Structure formats: C-alpha cells, structure tokens
Design an enzyme around this catalytic site. Structure first.
Site, PDB file in Angstrom:
ATOM      1  N   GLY A 164       1.238  -1.145  -0.107  1.00 48.78           N
ATOM      2  CA  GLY A 164       0.019   0.053  -0.340  1.00 48.78           C
ATOM      3  C   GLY A 164       0.270   1.314   0.498  1.00 48.78           C
ATOM      4  CB  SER A 221       0.715   0.391  -4.508  1.00 52.35           C
ATOM      5  OG  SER A 221      -0.190   0.978  -3.530  1.00 52.35           O
ATOM      6  CB  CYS A 263     -13.269   9.647   8.052  1.00 52.80           C
ATOM      7  SG  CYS A 263     -11.593  10.324   7.498  1.00 52.80           S
ATOM      8  CB  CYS A 319      -8.862  16.455  11.515  1.00 45.36           C
ATOM      9  SG  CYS A 319      -9.241  14.890  10.958  1.00 45.36           S
TER      10      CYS A 319
HETATM   11  C1  LIG Z   1     -11.836  11.889   2.255  1.00 44.61           C
HETATM   12  C2  LIG Z   1     -10.619  12.279   3.043  1.00 44.61           C
HETATM   13  C3  LIG Z   1      -9.999  13.271   3.824  1.00 44.61           C
HETATM   14  C4  LIG Z   1      -8.947  13.308   4.886  1.00 44.61           C
HETATM   15  N1  LIG Z   1      -8.916  14.052   5.401  1.00 44.61           N
HETATM   16  C5  LIG Z   1      -7.524  13.799   6.984  1.00 44.61           C
HETATM   17  C6  LIG Z   1      -7.197  15.018   7.554  1.00 44.61           C
HETATM   18  O1  LIG Z   1      -7.429  16.186   6.551  1.00 44.61           O
HETATM   19  N2  LIG Z   1      -6.657  15.481   7.752  1.00 44.61           N
HETATM   20  C7  LIG Z   1      -5.954  13.425   8.746  1.00 44.61           C
HETATM   21  O2  LIG Z   1      -4.734  13.791   9.265  1.00 44.61           O
HETATM   22  N3  LIG Z   1      -6.592  13.167   8.212  1.00 44.61           N
HETATM   23  C8  LIG Z   1      -6.830  12.817   7.218  1.00 44.61           C
HETATM   24  N4  LIG Z   1      -8.013  11.883   6.322  1.00 44.61           N
HETATM   25  C9  LIG Z   1      -7.542  10.178   6.908  1.00 44.61           C
HETATM   26  C10 LIG Z   1      -6.321   9.450   6.492  1.00 44.61           C
HETATM   27  O3  LIG Z   1      -5.348  10.679   7.134  1.00 44.61           O
HETATM   28  C11 LIG Z   1      -6.455   8.902   5.717  1.00 44.61           C
HETATM   29  O4  LIG Z   1      -7.150   8.395   5.064  1.00 44.61           O
HETATM   30  C12 LIG Z   1      -5.059   8.867   4.973  1.00 44.61           C
HETATM   31  O5  LIG Z   1      -5.644   8.355   3.075  1.00 44.61           O
HETATM   32  C13 LIG Z   1      -4.662   7.377   5.009  1.00 44.61           C
HETATM   33  O6  LIG Z   1      -3.471   6.034   4.844  1.00 44.61           O
HETATM   34  P1  LIG Z   1      -3.113   5.108   5.572  1.00 44.61           P
HETATM   35  O7  LIG Z   1      -1.710   4.470   4.752  1.00 44.61           O
HETATM   36  O8  LIG Z   1      -4.059   4.544   6.195  1.00 44.61           O
HETATM   37  O9  LIG Z   1      -4.329   4.353   4.277  1.00 44.61           O
HETATM   38  P2  LIG Z   1      -4.210   4.911   2.316  1.00 44.61           P
HETATM   39  O10 LIG Z   1      -3.818   6.113   2.299  1.00 44.61           O
HETATM   40  O11 LIG Z   1      -5.455   4.976   1.986  1.00 44.61           O
HETATM   41  O12 LIG Z   1      -3.695   3.786   1.651  1.00 44.61           O
HETATM   42  C14 LIG Z   1      -4.104   3.052   1.285  1.00 44.61           C
HETATM   43  C15 LIG Z   1      -3.391   2.369  -0.002  1.00 44.61           C
HETATM   44  O13 LIG Z   1      -3.616   1.149   0.036  1.00 44.61           O
HETATM   45  C16 LIG Z   1      -3.535   0.781  -1.582  1.00 44.61           C
HETATM   46  N5  LIG Z   1      -4.180  -0.940  -1.705  1.00 44.61           N
HETATM   47  C17 LIG Z   1      -4.984  -0.764  -0.035  1.00 44.61           C
HETATM   48  N6  LIG Z   1      -5.653  -2.692  -0.806  1.00 44.61           N
HETATM   49  C18 LIG Z   1      -4.472  -3.090  -1.356  1.00 44.61           C
HETATM   50  C19 LIG Z   1      -4.097  -4.356  -1.857  1.00 44.61           C
HETATM   51  N7  LIG Z   1      -5.011  -5.160  -1.705  1.00 44.61           N
HETATM   52  N8  LIG Z   1      -2.728  -4.679  -2.694  1.00 44.61           N
HETATM   53  C20 LIG Z   1      -2.268  -2.911  -3.134  1.00 44.61           C
HETATM   54  N9  LIG Z   1      -2.664  -2.098  -2.257  1.00 44.61           N
HETATM   55  C21 LIG Z   1      -3.640  -2.139  -2.425  1.00 44.61           C
HETATM   56  C22 LIG Z   1      -4.580   1.887  -1.883  1.00 44.61           C
HETATM   57  O14 LIG Z   1      -5.248   1.733  -2.931  1.00 44.61           O
HETATM   58  C23 LIG Z   1      -3.582   2.840  -1.011  1.00 44.61           C
HETATM   59  O15 LIG Z   1      -2.869   3.204  -2.098  1.00 44.61           O
HETATM   60  C24 LIG Z   1      -8.946  12.230   5.224  1.00 44.61           C
HETATM   61  C25 LIG Z   1      -9.575  10.639   4.826  1.00 44.61           C
HETATM   62  C26 LIG Z   1     -11.059  10.440   3.585  1.00 44.61           C
HETATM   63  C27 LIG Z   1     -10.971   9.856   2.962  1.00 44.61           C
HETATM   64  C1  LIG Z   2     -11.505  19.696  11.041  1.00 45.53           C
HETATM   65  C2  LIG Z   2     -12.829  18.689  10.539  1.00 45.53           C
HETATM   66  C3  LIG Z   2     -13.860  19.627  11.292  1.00 45.53           C
HETATM   67  C4  LIG Z   2     -15.371  20.135  10.567  1.00 45.53           C
HETATM   68  C5  LIG Z   2     -14.528  20.866   8.906  1.00 45.53           C
HETATM   69  C6  LIG Z   2     -15.710  21.379   8.816  1.00 45.53           C
HETATM   70  C7  LIG Z   2     -16.709  22.206   9.029  1.00 45.53           C
HETATM   71  C8  LIG Z   2     -17.402  23.910   9.030  1.00 45.53           C
HETATM   72  C9  LIG Z   2     -17.306  23.969   9.741  1.00 45.53           C
HETATM   73  C10 LIG Z   2     -18.509  25.553   9.713  1.00 45.53           C
HETATM   74  C11 LIG Z   2     -18.236  26.778  10.690  1.00 45.53           C
HETATM   75  C12 LIG Z   2     -18.858  27.463   9.836  1.00 45.53           C
HETATM   76  O1  LIG Z   2     -18.623  29.003  11.055  1.00 45.53           O
HETATM   77  C13 LIG Z   2     -17.994  29.444  11.190  1.00 45.53           C
HETATM   78  O2  LIG Z   2     -17.407  29.985  12.315  1.00 45.53           O
HETATM   79  C14 LIG Z   2     -17.027  30.702  13.525  1.00 45.53           C
HETATM   80  C15 LIG Z   2     -16.850  30.783  15.269  1.00 45.53           C
HETATM   81  O3  LIG Z   2     -17.060  30.272  16.144  1.00 45.53           O
HETATM   82  C16 LIG Z   2     -17.303  32.063  13.457  1.00 45.53           C
HETATM   83  O4  LIG Z   2     -15.346  32.760  13.624  1.00 45.53           O
HETATM   84  C17 LIG Z   2     -15.847  33.190  14.421  1.00 45.53           C
HETATM   85  O5  LIG Z   2     -14.876  32.995  15.474  1.00 45.53           O
HETATM   86  C18 LIG Z   2     -13.713  33.163  14.468  1.00 45.53           C
HETATM   87  C19 LIG Z   2     -12.648  32.457  15.012  1.00 45.53           C
HETATM   88  O6  LIG Z   2     -12.411  31.360  15.365  1.00 45.53           O
HETATM   89  C20 LIG Z   2     -12.758  34.854  14.053  1.00 45.53           C
HETATM   90  O7  LIG Z   2     -12.340  34.606  13.749  1.00 45.53           O
HETATM   91  C21 LIG Z   2     -14.434  35.318  13.369  1.00 45.53           C
HETATM   92  O8  LIG Z   2     -14.628  36.795  12.862  1.00 45.53           O
HETATM   93  C22 LIG Z   2     -16.061  35.416  14.535  1.00 45.53           C
HETATM   94  O9  LIG Z   2     -16.657  35.258  14.166  1.00 45.53           O
HETATM   95  C23 LIG Z   2     -17.461  32.357  12.196  1.00 45.53           C
HETATM   96  O10 LIG Z   2     -18.317  33.091  11.592  1.00 45.53           O
HETATM   97  C24 LIG Z   2     -18.206  30.745  11.613  1.00 45.53           C
HETATM   98  O11 LIG Z   2     -18.641  31.783  10.068  1.00 45.53           O
END
Ligand SMILES: Cc1cc2nc3c(=O)[nH]c(=O)nc-3n(C[C@H](O)[C@H](O)[C@H](O)COP(=O)(O)OP(=O)(O)OC[C@H]3O[C@@H](n4cnc5c(N)ncnc54)[C@H](O)[C@@H]3O)c2cc1C
Ligand SMILES: CCCCCCCCCCCCO[C@@H]1O[C@H](CO)[C@@H](O[C@H]2O[C@H](CO)[C@@H](O)[C@H](O)[C@H]2O)[C@H](O)[C@H]1O
Length: 421
Positions: A11, A37, A163, A359
């Site tokens: 992977g 992979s 997630c 995240c």
């Molecule tokens: C949409 C989304 C957004 C995310 N956002 C964040 C975030 O913002 N911040 C964060 O910290 N984490 C995030 N995550 C969580 C996580 O970090 C990711 O899912 C990350 O890619 C996990 O890595 P991994 O190595 O465990 O699996 P993966 O990245 O999915 O890698 C697995 C690999 O194995 C391969 N594979 C599977 N089976 C086989 C097989 N049989 N043979 C060969 N290859 C194979 C796949 O093709 C893939 O390449 C997110 C997850 C998702 C789905």
């Molecule tokens: C990472 C994974 C988590 C979930 C992913 C994202 C989901 C979407 C988030 C929705 C937020 C929208 O709502 C938003 O929130 C904050 C409230 O604290 C507001 O922001 C407020 O606090 C922030 C600071 O933290 C100031 O900069 C801002 O002036 C104040 O008004 C925004 O005016 C509002 O528009």
C-alpha cells in the site's frame, strides 16, 4: 533472504509511501525494500473533497510513484495483492505472480464498505463518494449534472463511518460553490444525515465547541441536519433513512429523494488482508501490539487505517474513531524502527505514542481544524479552531507532503516544529 532480509510495504498511501522511504533509509543497501500497491500513483487524500466540488484537479494532488522511489533504491510493483499466505510468506498478485517476503508491512488503508448499504456504491446510484480521486472526479461529474438539473442534495456519513470531518467539509464547500455559481437558490432541499449521536461528535465525542460551531454553520448555509441515522438502502434515487434514539429503538423513518449526494461509508480492512486467517478482527483490521507488530505473525507489521484500534464508546448508531495523519506517521516510524531492530537483534521498544486525532478542513478562505488527545476525556488537548490560518496551514501542508513524497524522507517526519526553534 538470510543476512539480506526482504521487506515489503503493502500500500502506497499516506502511511506506506513514507514507510518505504523510511524503511530503505533505515535498512540501507544490504536489504531489499519493495513497495507493492494497487495504483501506479500517489494521491493526497485530504484534497479529495475539493476535487469533489471541482476546486482542485487530479494533477494537482496526484503523481506517478515509480521514478521517485526507484531513484531511492526501492522496488515498485504497481499491482494489487489478491492473496497473502502468512505461513509461506508469499503474496499473490493480481497478475498471478508471487512475491516472497521476510518482513511484511501492511499499509493498505480502508475498504470502502458500500456493501453495508445496498444502492450506496457510487456506480449504483446518486450517492457519490469523495474518498479517492477516482470517486471525487466522479462526484464532481454528478455535481455538474445537478447544476444542469437542480434537485435535492444529501450529504453525510453512514453508520460505521469514522471519518466525519470530510462530510462536513463537503457539505459546506458545495453550499459555498453553489452560492458562488449563484445557484444555491435552485436547490429544493439540502440535508445532512449522520450516524453521529450529535452534530460535531466527529467520532471523538466532540472536540472544543465542534458541536455548536458545526451546528451553527449548517444552519447558516440552510442545511437541515439529522443525527443518529443509519441508511438502510439507496434505491430508485431515494435514500431510506432510519433514525434511532439513545437506546437504538426507532423514532422515525424517512425517505429522501436524492439528485446528488455524498455519504462517507464505513471503513473495513481490504480483502487480501482481512482474508489472512487469524490476522484481523471481524472488520478486517490487523490486530497489532504497541510496536505495530501483528499479534499472530512476528514478521508482519501494520500501520495506518489498516490497524485495529479498540472503541472507547458505543453510540446509538455504530460509529468509529478516526485514524489521522500524525498518528499514522508515528505508527509508520515505529514499525520501521522495530523491524530494523529485529534485523539487528533486539525487540524494538518503539511505540505509536499517545493516541490523537488531528484534522484540518479548508472552506476556501478559512478553515476548521481540531486537535484531540488522548482518546478518552478528560483530554490533555481538546481544541477546535477556525480561521484563515487553518486554510494557510492546509495549503501549506499539502505542498510540503507532496514534495516530501517526491524527494524522500529519512526522517522523523513532523519536524513541523522548526517554526518555533
Ligand atoms: C476524504 C478523506 C479526507 C481525509 N482528511 C484528512 C485530514 O484532513 N487530516 C488527516 O490527518 N487525515 C485525513 N484523512 C484520514 C487519513 O489520513 C487518510 O485516509 C489517509 O490516506 C490514511 O492513510 P493509510 O495509509 O492508512 O491508507 P491509504 O492512504 O488509503 O493508502 C492505502 C493504500 O493501499 C492500497 N491498497 C489497498 N489494498 C491493496 C492491495 N490489495 N494491494 C495493493 N495495494 C492496496 C490503496 O490503493 C492505497 O494506495 C482523510 C480521509 C479521507 C478519506
Ligand atoms: C476539521 C474537521 C472539522 C469539521 C470540518 C469543517 C466544518 C465546517 C465549519 C463551519 C464553521 C462556520 O461558522 C463560522 O464559525 C466561527 C465561529 O466560531 C465564526 O468565526 C468566529 O470565530 C472566529 C475565530 O475562531 C473569528 O475569526 C470570527 O471573526 C468569528 O466571527 C464564523 O463567523 C462562522 O462563520
């Protein structure tokens, strides 16, 4: 082979890509490192939701792997493993070929378990996916078809999902991009369905004010929201939703028309790994110790989504705790250090560290991000932040990561603590 162990990383994703680099770096020229992979390209997963709304292209977030690892002495097989024999230590590839290993590092991430919900596969109905660039590209395509024929939108997370962030993120950026196209007004309804017991649970019992902030945000965008939902089936372009109470009993059932939807599915272990007798829990997750070593096979290690982590809570509708970037890297680096110690005589004592979830979500101009640790409350860190800096941070980390995945890593990764020193 003997005195020249062959280490396979299975992977090439967020854990496996660095793992191969770090492994080669650790073992040196006297050991063969092979990365196996399913696809021939690396993709930056956290960028997919943006591809799903058309805010990013495939080429911005994906690149061909072969050149970048081979110049580092790593062998690369762009092929899916169909079968793993842990006794003979042989991996059977899709093409029939067989690969032997002395040590196996499993980094296969999640199987997207669409089968849990008949109709929910992106190829079977209107409920799409943003988990992979293939799926996200496809989600955006259907999004254009919604733009041509406005209709109800349904975004959310299924039962068993872990997630949640991306579901929220996707809902907001769609709203955001509708507004920008000046076509939010044409949408009959915009519904958010989640298996969380409340908005902003995030599978971690909430972090900071994720509950109030995410609640207020969905409201701001005119998105109606239901918690404690499972989807029983997707069918006839309709989503059949069952909503329970704190005890599992049903308190209502809905039937939601969907012209365009995206539900985060439950994650299971991929089949080739799940299918290794005695290797995995019932979900297909590799049962490993604190050093990332499988509990049944001493020469099998696991990192990333692939590993099993015990639940700390049982929600009305089943939900899981996420496995995120920073902790995945600790899993990787520990596993590397522990295999190397084996190759060199000792038990590696290195561990994943304290459990944590980090995240980041970008909404365009500003972002939301949280840090939670350890897993159980009361936590040592429990922060939910919103701002522009979160956006700057997301943009910056993607650039950094893709670059590092190209130039290689030794390399205690998150030295993202030099911006202090
Ligand atoms: C949409 C989304 C957004 C995310 N956002 C964040 C975030 O913002 N911040 C964060 O910290 N984490 C995030 N995550 C969580 C996580 O970090 C990711 O899912 C990350 O890619 C996990 O890595 P991994 O190595 O465990 O699996 P993966 O990245 O999915 O890698 C697995 C690999 O194995 C391969 N594979 C599977 N089976 C086989 C097989 N049989 N043979 C060969 N290859 C194979 C796949 O093709 C893939 O390449 C997110 C997850 C998702 C789905
Ligand atoms: C990472 C994974 C988590 C979930 C992913 C994202 C989901 C979407 C988030 C929705 C937020 C929208 O709502 C938003 O929130 C904050 C409230 O604290 C507001 O922001 C407020 O606090 C922030 C600071 O933290 C100031 O900069 C801002 O002036 C104040 O008004 C925004 O005016 C509002 O528009």
């Amino acid at each position: 082979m003997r005195g020249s162990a062959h280490v396979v990383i299975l992977g090439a994703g967020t854990g496996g890509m660095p793992a191969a680099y770090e492994m080669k770096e650790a073992l040196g020229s006297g050991h063969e490192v092979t990365l196996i992979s399913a696809n021939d390209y690396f993709q930056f997963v956290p960028s997919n939701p943006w591809v799903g709304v058309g805010w990013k292209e495939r080429d911005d977030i994906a690149f061909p792997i072969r050149h970048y690892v081979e110049r580092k002495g790593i062998h690369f097989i762009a092929q899916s493993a169909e079968q793993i024999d842990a006794e003979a230590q042989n991996i059977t590839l899709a093409d029939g070929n067989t690969v032997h290993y002395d040590y196996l590092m499993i980094a296969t991430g999640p199987k997207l378990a669409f089968e849990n919900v008949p109709g929910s596969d992106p190829h079977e109905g209107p409920v799409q996916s943003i988990a992979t660039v293939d799926h996200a590209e496809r989600a955006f395509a259907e999004y254009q078809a919604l733009l041509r024929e406005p209709g109800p939108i349904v975004i959310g997370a299924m039962a068993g999902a872990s997630c949640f962030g991306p579901a929220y993120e996707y809902a907001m950026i769609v709203a955001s991009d509708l507004k920008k196209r000046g076509m939010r007004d044409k949408i009959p309804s915009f519904t958010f369905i989640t298996s969380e017991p409340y908005i902003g649970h995030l599978g971690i019992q909430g972090v900071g004010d994720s509950k109030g902030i995410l609640t207020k945000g969905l409201k701001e965008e005119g998105i109606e929201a239901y918690t404690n939902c499972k989807v029983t089936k997707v069918e006839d372009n309709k989503m059949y939703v069952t909503q329970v109470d704190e005890k599992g009993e049903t308190i209502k059932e809905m039937v939601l028309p969907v012209k365009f939807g995206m539900m985060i599915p439950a994650f299971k272990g991929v089949p080739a790994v799940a299918g290794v007798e005695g290797l995995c829990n019932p979900g297909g997750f590799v049962l490993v110790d604190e050093h990332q070593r499988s509990k049944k096979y001493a020469n099998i290690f696991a990192a990333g989504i692939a590993i099993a982590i015990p639940p700390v809570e049982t929600t009305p509708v089943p939900t899981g705790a996420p496995k995120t970037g920073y902790m995945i890297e600790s899993m990787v680096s520990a596993a590397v250090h522990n295999i190397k110690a084996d190759l060199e005589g000792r038990k590696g004592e290195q561990t994943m560290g304290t459990w944590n979830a980090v995240c980041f979500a970008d909404m365009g101009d500003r972002g939301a991000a949280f840090i939670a640790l350890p897993q159980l409350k009361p936590r040592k860190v429990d922060v939910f932040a919103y701002g522009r800096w979160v956006h700057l941070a997301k943009v910056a980390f993607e650039k950094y990561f893709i670059r590092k995945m190209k130039m290689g890593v030794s390399e205690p990764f998150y030295e993202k603590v030099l911006f202090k020193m």
